[PDB]
Scaffold this motif. Structure first.
Motif, PDB file in Angstrom:
ATOM      1  N   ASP A  36      -5.589   8.275   9.352  1.00 21.20           N
ATOM      2  CA  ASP A  36      -4.537   8.112   8.292  1.00 21.20           C
ATOM      3  C   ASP A  36      -3.317   7.466   8.910  1.00 21.20           C
ATOM      4  O   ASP A  36      -2.963   7.815  10.015  1.00 21.20           O
ATOM      5  N   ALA A  37      -2.709   6.572   8.196  1.00 19.44           N
ATOM      6  CA  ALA A  37      -1.498   5.897   8.747  1.00 19.44           C
ATOM      7  C   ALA A  37      -0.297   6.851   8.637  1.00 19.44           C
ATOM      8  O   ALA A  37      -0.371   7.860   7.955  1.00 19.44           O
ATOM      9  N   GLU A  38       0.778   6.492   9.302  1.00 17.91           N
ATOM     10  CA  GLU A  38       2.035   7.317   9.269  1.00 17.91           C
ATOM     11  C   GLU A  38       2.862   6.640   8.166  1.00 17.91           C
ATOM     12  O   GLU A  38       2.636   5.481   7.840  1.00 17.91           O
ATOM     13  N   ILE A  39       3.804   7.352   7.625  1.00 21.52           N
ATOM     14  CA  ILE A  39       4.647   6.759   6.551  1.00 21.52           C
ATOM     15  C   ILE A  39       5.495   5.630   7.220  1.00 21.52           C
ATOM     16  O   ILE A  39       6.078   5.827   8.272  1.00 21.52           O
ATOM     17  N   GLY A  40       5.541   4.490   6.596  1.00 26.20           N
ATOM     18  CA  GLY A  40       6.316   3.310   7.104  1.00 26.20           C
ATOM     19  C   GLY A  40       5.733   2.624   8.338  1.00 26.20           C
ATOM     20  O   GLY A  40       6.429   1.841   8.966  1.00 26.20           O
ATOM     21  N   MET A  41       4.491   2.897   8.651  1.00 20.50           N
ATOM     22  CA  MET A  41       3.822   2.282   9.855  1.00 20.50           C
ATOM     23  C   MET A  41       3.481   0.781   9.673  1.00 20.50           C
ATOM     24  O   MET A  41       3.545   0.019  10.617  1.00 20.50           O
ATOM     25  N   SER A  42       3.119   0.422   8.477  1.00 22.48           N
ATOM     26  CA  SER A  42       2.750  -0.982   8.093  1.00 22.48           C
ATOM     27  C   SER A  42       3.504  -1.393   6.776  1.00 22.48           C
ATOM     28  O   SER A  42       2.924  -1.561   5.717  1.00 22.48           O
ATOM     29  N   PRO A  43       4.805  -1.547   6.845  1.00 22.77           N
ATOM     30  CA  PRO A  43       5.635  -1.804   5.646  1.00 22.77           C
ATOM     31  C   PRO A  43       5.345  -3.146   4.969  1.00 22.77           C
ATOM     32  O   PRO A  43       5.835  -3.418   3.885  1.00 22.77           O
ATOM     33  N   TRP A  44       4.548  -3.957   5.623  1.00 21.64           N
ATOM     34  CA  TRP A  44       4.171  -5.293   5.077  1.00 21.64           C
ATOM     35  C   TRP A  44       2.782  -5.165   4.334  1.00 21.64           C
ATOM     36  O   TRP A  44       2.337  -6.128   3.731  1.00 21.64           O
ATOM     37  N   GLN A  45       2.130  -4.024   4.376  1.00 26.75           N
ATOM     38  CA  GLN A  45       0.805  -3.900   3.672  1.00 26.75           C
ATOM     39  C   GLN A  45       0.981  -4.003   2.151  1.00 26.75           C
ATOM     40  O   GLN A  45       1.861  -3.365   1.589  1.00 26.75           O
ATOM     41  N   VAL A  46       0.147  -4.802   1.523  1.00 26.78           N
ATOM     42  CA  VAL A  46       0.174  -5.011   0.051  1.00 26.78           C
ATOM     43  C   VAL A  46      -1.232  -4.680  -0.516  1.00 26.78           C
ATOM     44  O   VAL A  46      -2.236  -4.804   0.171  1.00 26.78           O
ATOM     45  N   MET A  47      -1.264  -4.279  -1.762  1.00 24.31           N
ATOM     46  CA  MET A  47      -2.549  -3.919  -2.478  1.00 24.31           C
ATOM     47  C   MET A  47      -2.687  -4.905  -3.644  1.00 24.31           C
ATOM     48  O   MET A  47      -1.715  -5.084  -4.364  1.00 24.31           O
ATOM     49  N   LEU A  48      -3.842  -5.506  -3.800  1.00 26.58           N
ATOM     50  CA  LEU A  48      -4.032  -6.469  -4.938  1.00 26.58           C
ATOM     51  C   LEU A  48      -4.774  -5.525  -5.849  1.00 26.58           C
ATOM     52  O   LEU A  48      -5.795  -4.971  -5.455  1.00 26.58           O
ATOM     53  N   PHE A  49      -4.236  -5.387  -7.027  1.00 26.58           N
ATOM     54  CA  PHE A  49      -4.812  -4.474  -8.051  1.00 26.58           C
ATOM     55  C   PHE A  49      -5.190  -5.248  -9.314  1.00 26.58           C
ATOM     56  O   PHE A  49      -4.451  -6.114  -9.760  1.00 26.58           O
ATOM     57  N   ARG A  50      -6.317  -4.916  -9.878  1.00 25.15           N
ATOM     58  CA  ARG A  50      -6.748  -5.637 -11.116  1.00 25.15           C
ATOM     59  C   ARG A  50      -6.168  -4.872 -12.324  1.00 25.15           C
ATOM     60  O   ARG A  50      -6.085  -3.663 -12.291  1.00 25.15           O
ATOM     61  N   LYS A  51      -5.802  -5.582 -13.353  1.00 24.33           N
ATOM     62  CA  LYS A  51      -5.235  -4.892 -14.543  1.00 24.33           C
ATOM     63  C   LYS A  51      -6.351  -4.262 -15.397  1.00 24.33           C
ATOM     64  O   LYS A  51      -6.218  -3.106 -15.741  1.00 24.33           O
ATOM     65  N   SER A  52      -7.394  -4.958 -15.753  1.00 26.35           N
ATOM     66  CA  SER A  52      -8.459  -4.296 -16.587  1.00 26.35           C
ATOM     67  C   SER A  52      -9.862  -4.764 -16.133  1.00 26.35           C
ATOM     68  O   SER A  52     -10.111  -5.956 -16.129  1.00 26.35           O
ATOM     69  N   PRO A  53     -10.745  -3.860 -15.755  1.00 26.78           N
ATOM     70  CA  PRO A  53     -10.452  -2.429 -15.427  1.00 26.78           C
ATOM     71  C   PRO A  53      -9.412  -2.301 -14.282  1.00 26.78           C
ATOM     72  O   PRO A  53      -9.313  -3.176 -13.432  1.00 26.78           O
ATOM     73  N   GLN A  54      -8.699  -1.212 -14.291  1.00 26.11           N
ATOM     74  CA  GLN A  54      -7.681  -1.017 -13.231  1.00 26.11           C
ATOM     75  C   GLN A  54      -8.418  -0.650 -11.951  1.00 26.11           C
ATOM     76  O   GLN A  54      -8.951   0.443 -11.881  1.00 26.11           O
ATOM     77  N   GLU A  55      -8.458  -1.556 -11.000  1.00 28.20           N
ATOM     78  CA  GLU A  55      -9.154  -1.276  -9.690  1.00 28.20           C
ATOM     79  C   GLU A  55      -8.573  -2.058  -8.476  1.00 28.20           C
ATOM     80  O   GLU A  55      -7.914  -3.081  -8.631  1.00 28.20           O
ATOM     81  N   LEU A  56      -8.890  -1.518  -7.322  1.00 30.75           N
ATOM     82  CA  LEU A  56      -8.440  -2.086  -6.022  1.00 30.75           C
ATOM     83  C   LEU A  56      -9.393  -3.233  -5.803  1.00 30.75           C
ATOM     84  O   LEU A  56     -10.587  -3.058  -5.904  1.00 30.75           O
ATOM     85  N   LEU A  57      -8.804  -4.353  -5.506  1.00 30.65           N
ATOM     86  CA  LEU A  57      -9.555  -5.608  -5.254  1.00 30.65           C
ATOM     87  C   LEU A  57      -9.610  -5.922  -3.751  1.00 30.65           C
ATOM     88  O   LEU A  57     -10.678  -6.014  -3.184  1.00 30.65           O
ATOM     89  N   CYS A  58      -8.451  -6.067  -3.160  1.00 29.61           N
ATOM     90  CA  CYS A  58      -8.304  -6.393  -1.706  1.00 29.61           C
ATOM     91  C   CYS A  58      -6.955  -5.918  -1.153  1.00 29.61           C
ATOM     92  O   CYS A  58      -6.154  -5.301  -1.836  1.00 29.61           O
TER      93      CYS A  58
END
Ligand SMILES: [Ca+2]
Ligand code: NA
Lengths: 36, 252, 10
Positions: free
Chosen positions: B6-28
Motif C-alpha cells: 500500500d502506498a503512503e499518503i502523498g507518496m505519488s502526488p502526480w498519480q492520476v486515474m482515468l475513469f469512464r463515465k458509463s459504466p463508471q469504471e477504472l480504465l488506466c
C-alpha cells in the motif's frame, strides 16, 4: 510540463519539502550504486 | 500491481486515474506533468482489435487519490478534458511501438499536499539513470493477481533489465522506444504491473538534485508476474520532442 | 463497486 523539468516539479509537499523520506526510497538510491 | 504494498499518503502526488463515465469504471493510470497536462499510454484510448476508441466526452481524470473506489471529498479533484493527442506513429497493429498520448484539461488544477507534478527527464538525467540494475517505482490500482483488486494505491520497486535479456524473453519485436523491467527468476523477488495499471508512471529519484523524474509509462506484458517474463515500458526521453511540440503548439 | 461522484462532473 516539458523540457528538462519545471519550476518545482518532483519535490513532494509531504516528503522532500519537509526533509522527510518514504519507507522504500532508500532501496532505489542504494541501487544507483548508493546515493549521498 | 502484483507483490507490491500500500502506498503512503502523498507518496505519488502526480498519480492520476482515468475513469469512464458509463459504466463508471477504472480504465488506466496516468501522470500530471503541469497544471493543465496529463500523460498516459495510447492503447488506453485507442485499440481497434478490441473496438476501443475513446473520446474526450467519455472520460474523467481524478487527481489526488489514495482509495480506489471512494469519492475522497475535499481531497481529490475531478477534471474534464479539452483535447487528447495520440502519437502519429503509435503502432497498434504490431507491437505497441510509441505507446504515448497527452490529454489537455478543461481548466488548470490547483496543487496541494496531495497534487504535485513530476519532472520529465533531460538527456543527461536519462543517460545517468537508465542503466541495467538501477531500480524504478511503479504505482497503480490494477489487479493483484493475473486471475483481487486493492482498496488503496499499491507500489513496487523494480530493476531495469539489459536489452538482450528483454529480447530473448519474447517473440515480439522490441524497439529503441521501449525498455523492460523486473526481477529474474533467480532473484527470489517478484513484482509486476497487471491489468488496470497501464498508462501509469515508472519513476526514479535523482541523487544529484533530489527530484523525481518519470522515465517510463506502463505499456505491455505477457501475463502478470510470470517467471521468465518482464514488463515493457514506453521510453519517455526518446519521445520528448514530440511532447514539447504539442505543448508549446497547443498550450502550456 | 465505485462510489457515486457528484453530478456536476458528468
Ligand atoms: Ca525474441
Ligand atoms: Na517476471
Amino acid at each position: 510540463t516539458f523540457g528538462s523539468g519545471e519550476a518545482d516539479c518532483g519535490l513532494r509537499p509531504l516528503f522532500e519539502k519537509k526533509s522527510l523520506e518514504d519507507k522504500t526510497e532508500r532501496e532505489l538510491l542504494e541501487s544507483y550504486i548508493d546515493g549521498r | 500491481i502484483v507483490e507490491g504494498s500500500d502506498a503512503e499518503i502523498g507518496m505519488s502526488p502526480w498519480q492520476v486515474m482515468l475513469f469512464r463515465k458509463s459504466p463508471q469504471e477504472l480504465l488506466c493510470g496516468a501522470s500530471l506533468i503541469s497544471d493543465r497536462w496529463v500523460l498516459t499510454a495510447a492503447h488506453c484510448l485507442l485499440y481497434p482489435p478490441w473496438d476501443k476508441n475513446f473520446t474526450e466526452n467519455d472520460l474523467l481524470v481524478r487527481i489526488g487519490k489514495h482509495s480506489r473506489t471512494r469519492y475522497e471529498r475535499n481531497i481529490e479533484k475531478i477534471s474534464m478534458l479539452e483535447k487528447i493527442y495520440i502519437h502519429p506513429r503509435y503502432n497498434w497493429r504490431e507491437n505497441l511501438d510509441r505507446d504515448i498520448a497527452l490529454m489537455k484539461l478543461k481548466k488548470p488544477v490547483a496543487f496541494s499536499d496531495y497534487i504535485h507534478p513530476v519532472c520529465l527527464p533531460d538527456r543527461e538525467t536519462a543517460a545517468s539513470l537508465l542503466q541495467a540494475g538501477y531500480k524504478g517505482r511503479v504505482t497503480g490500482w490494477g489487479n493483484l493477481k493475473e486471475t483481487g483488486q486493492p482498496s488503496v494505491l499499491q507500489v513496487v520497486n523494480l530493476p531495469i533489465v539489459e536489452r538482450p535479456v528483454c529480447k530473448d524473453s519474447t517473440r515480439i519485436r522490441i524497439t529503441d522506444n521501449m525498455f523492460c523491467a523486473g526481477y529474474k527468476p533467480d532473484e527470489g523477488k517478484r513484482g509486476d504491473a497487471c491489468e488496470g495499471d497501464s498508462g501509469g508512471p515508472f519513476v526514479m529519484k535523482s541523487p544529484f538534485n533530489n527530484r523525481w523524474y518519470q522515465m517510463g509509462i506502463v505499456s505491455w506484458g505477457e501475463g502478470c508476474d510470470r517467471d521468465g517474463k518482464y514488463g515493457f515500458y514506453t521510453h519517455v526521453f526518446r519521445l520528448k520532442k514530440w511532447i514539447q511540440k504539442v505543448i508549446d503548439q497547443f498550450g502550456e | 463497486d465505485f462510489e457515486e461522484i457528484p453530478e456536476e462532473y458528468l
